[PDB]
Amino acid sequence: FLDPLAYEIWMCIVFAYIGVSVVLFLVSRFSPYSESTNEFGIFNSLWFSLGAFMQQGCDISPRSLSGRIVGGVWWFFTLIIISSYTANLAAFLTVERMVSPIESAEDLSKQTEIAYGTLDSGSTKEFFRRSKIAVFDKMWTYMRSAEPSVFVRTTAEGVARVRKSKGKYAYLLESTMNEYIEQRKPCD
Amino acid sequence: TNEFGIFNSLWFSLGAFMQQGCDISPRSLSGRIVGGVWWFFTLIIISSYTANLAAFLTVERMVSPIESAEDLSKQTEIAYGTLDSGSTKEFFRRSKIAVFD
Amino acid sequence: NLAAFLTVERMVSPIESAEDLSKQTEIAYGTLDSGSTKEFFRRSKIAVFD
Amino acid sequence: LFDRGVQMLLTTVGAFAAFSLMTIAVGTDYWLYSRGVCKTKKKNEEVMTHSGLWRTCCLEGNFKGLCKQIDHFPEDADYEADTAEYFLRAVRASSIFPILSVILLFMGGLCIAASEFYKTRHNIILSAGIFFVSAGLSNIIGIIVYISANAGKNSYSYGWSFYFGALSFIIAEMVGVLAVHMFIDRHKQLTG
Amino acid sequence: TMKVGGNLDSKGYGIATPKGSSLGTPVNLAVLKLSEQGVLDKLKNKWWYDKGECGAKDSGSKEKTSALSLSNVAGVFYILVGGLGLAMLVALIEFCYKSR
Amino acid sequence: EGNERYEGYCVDLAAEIAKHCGFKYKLTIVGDGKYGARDADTKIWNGMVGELVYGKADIAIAPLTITLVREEVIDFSKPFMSLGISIMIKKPQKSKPGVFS
Ligand SMILES: NS(=O)(=O)c1cc2c(cc1Cl)N[C@H]([C@H]1C[C@H]3C=C[C@@H]1C3)NS2(=O)=O
Ligand SMILES: C[C@]12C[C@@H]3C[C@](C)(C1)C[C@@](N)(C3)C2
């Protein structure tokens, strides 16, 4: 639930609450005169500044001019930070997906940040070697121009190079052999 | 009848707009209307205003120091030039347009 | 619901690139008659044009 | 209000404790863990960085503890004409507010010493509490400028000597509370 | 490094030959035939647009956030600390009012 | 040596044209490294334009731009597509929103 705001701001805003938690007290204790003439002690300044922070609280209030000044300013502060909490969850409760390049191998046919290869000496290599569909033909043009060799002579080597490359190497293979690496631990 | 100074009337609806309470209340005919409707203002304004707050805080625009390609004519702290013996160089020599000239 | 408003203006704003147009009868379309666009669609074999 | 008789000791020791922590925080050459350089050009690409307030320094570099006092630095690609950026750099070259806080807390020492020297002429003993709040503000603005500069995720980590910058604020305001608990009766004892 | 501004001219490239060289007419006819074949844009994709491999292809529009930070909202602390300064200054001056 | 050293838009379009019209071709580099213009003193054309005008080459296939002065000494074909003048600068970073934004 703290995700929308950084660690350091949650840490430091406490210091601002402390500040208002005693600035009301200093404001109130300048020469009330009777001694009783100014209400807010430390514990009530702390409380009213909290009821400002975490909202709610319908029971106490300072009559001082400087008191209502700092109260209004601290309310203005709180409105901003708390409503910013209420907003930024929109960036978390929507578009939560992590990352997923790429569908249809669209980006693979166009960029070299992710290497890819087929099984060597296999039906898929020969298919890319011939298939004239533009995405397939261009992926073949890469693999034929890709150096060092991208083709794996075993599915074991394919899976190994995919894993060791953290997904920067993508392995092209038949989907049931592919899905035996998804329905099975470590399923990464 | 009213626990109000002018500074109180200047304060109570501020706190109400901040959506937090203060010990005083209108407690009167035609004071109900003024205090209560003022909630509607913050209830719509704040709610709507405080919704894109986060996004706005990260818009990450660019300042675009020049955009018209003629701003460079206005200044010399930024130098500019063209390819020597180049088509653009000789065009700027040849194309006798004041903005270009 | 105010978020459901301000998060989205673009419902579909009909079809770009004539992609879904090429794949629907729900919107009719044509070129100018007796024109080089008409001839271009007559000859250009690119999938959307053809 | 309680322990009315001992509060002069408790306040004077609390003030000296706050002054000690404040000057340790200002004087310590390291505050937090970061990435950067050991020196004002360990210096080639990056190093684990172990700088303090006025001093830039590193940890687990090819050398350690050869820290340096910071100096003014320029900026790249504009945005320096803004008064907030310019003033942030002018402060970062030599952070005024922490040492001003040291000076205010020392002047609070003089104010509480003015309980005895030329003893308590009028309500002067109030001034310590004002100095302690102003020291609090000087610390909090120091922290705000320090973070808002150096945090520009950061992947940093914060050491105890960083947190002493905060704790010296928390304690300075507790000494403020003690100074008020002194003044509010001491000035009544002076003036009835 | 970045494009700013835009075209000053409706100019362009062309294939060129010695003046009166026999290549000019087959060149021009091939240039025309290539246009309806759509080769020219696919060469342009292959030599500019596919090669847009930098994250600037996407980084200006990506989803979610790395959480919000102090420096984006830090000015809110300035108006507070200034209010606390005023909260001191008011007492500092009202002393002289009570001293009257 | 022949044509496989070179890669690029003009290299490919050169291959496509020479295949389409079925003529043997040899890519070669201008000796002076210039695109080409007439010397203001000697009127001698340098660059690839010189290479054509003085028989050093048989056809030019390059980003050598169409100009009217070049059309005085060479023939430019129909164009494949247009382009125009532009400015290159180092971009400023994406702007962190204002302190009070
Ligand atoms: N779309 S583009 O920028 O890549 C572009 C630009 C141009 C192309 C072709 C393309 Cl693909 N050729 C046409 C020419 C073809 C013939 C018809 C007009 C000219 C002759 N004009 S153009 O302006 O020289
Ligand atoms: C209901 C609430 C809950 C929290 C977020 C909103 C936006 C809506 C403001 C509020 N004051 C605090 C009241």
Ligand SMILES: N[C@@H](CCC(=O)O)C(=O)O
């Ligand atoms: N079983 C496949 C393995 C190689 C491939 O999947 O391309 C074949 O017979 O060729």
Ligand SMILES: N[C@@H](CCC(=O)O)C(=O)O
């Ligand atoms: N293509 C241009 C390059 C130089 C320029 O545009 O200035 C030319 O033929 O000269």
